[PDB]
């Protein structure tokens, strides 16, 4: 038995066709982001709205090259 | 209260050698250049003087290539003077600073900034301390650098 | 798009939109200070700190007035184009106890 909390979402592919009895399913690889963000973070951005988005603090990024 | 400056260099691999040999614009010049024959911490000492010990930082890296870090000091107050020791590690150093130095032979320079707003022009410190030279070949050939 | 955000006049939507682009500007209340500057009144920067000749490279030396300004941190993306960075001796001063946002060429 499968529950709607079992299947996590797809952030890098898009369903383009499903046959009438669901036997064959065709997905299409989505094009990469123009800004260079990961498709995972675009997905999280879409699936999340919070009033208190986050704290001021600072990124742990490395040295600019 | 004047400060006593020291730099604890805790290398994990072949550290290299210091070289404060070349002459540059002597602005508040260095009064002392020292070293230590120790094994794990090749500490260095440079007991100089400045005017304003508010802005205090150690920039280590390549000035011409624009890859330099910012290290805050380790202050000690004994009642005699100031004791400013900044501990530089080898391993935690940013990847680019290692890859560039490994691929292109250029001495990693150290600069010390002692300054503040109240002082008059040219009374604050911005000068070249030493030039470490890298020895070990630890440099991955496929990295984001 | 053209954006402007100085200390004390930095919005939140612009900051978030720039954070989505890999550009992290300093928040409200953080200002740039440079003591080794030819200007004691305001912030001034020479043309030595120009970083891309395909945008602007002055045929002869010059200096630009900035006053109370801010700095940003950048990621290692192909799409980011650094134009003018902060002086080497500059630093971010905060009114509060916040760790300095930037330091030297990394602003």
Curated annotation (Swiss-Prot), chain A:
Places the protein is found: Endoplasmic reticulum membrane
Disordered: annotated span: 41-65
Family (UniProt): Belongs to the STT3 family.
Role: Catalytic subunit of the oligosaccharyl transferase (OST) complex that catalyzes the initial transfer of a defined glycan (Glc(3)Man(9)GlcNAc(2) in eukaryotes) from the lipid carrier dolichol-pyrophosphate to an asparagine residue within an Asn-X-Ser/Thr consensus motif in nascent polypeptide chains, the first step in protein N-glycosylation. N-glycosylation occurs cotranslationally and the complex associates with the Sec61 complex at the channel-forming translocon complex that mediates protein translocation across the endoplasmic reticulum (ER).
Quaternary state and interactors: Component of the oligosaccharyltransferase (OST) complex, which appears to exist in two assemblies comprising OST1, OST2, OST4, OST5, STT3, SWP1, WPB1, and either OST3 or OST6. OST assembly occurs through the formation of 3 subcomplexes. Subcomplex 1 contains OST1 and OST5, subcomplex 2 contains STT3, OST3, and OST4, and subcomplex 3 contains OST2, WBP1, and SWP1. Interacts with SEC61.
Domain comment in the entry: Despite low primary sequence conservation between eukaryotic catalytic subunits and bacterial and archaeal single subunit OSTs (ssOST), structural comparison revealed several common motifs at spatially equivalent positions, like the DXD motif 1 on the external loop 1 and the DXD motif 2 on the external loop 2 involved in binding of the metal ion cofactor and the carboxamide group of the acceptor asparagine, the conserved Glu residue of the TIXE/SVSE motif on the external loop 5 involved in catalysis, as well as the WWDYG and the DK/MI motifs in the globular domain that define the binding pocket for the +2 Ser/Thr of the acceptor sequon.
Note: Present with 3000 molecules/cell in log phase SD medium.
Name of the molecule in the record: Dolichyl-diphosphooligosaccharide--protein glycosyltransferase subunit STT3
Gene name for this UniProt entry: STT3
Residues of the full protein shown: 654 to 718 of 718
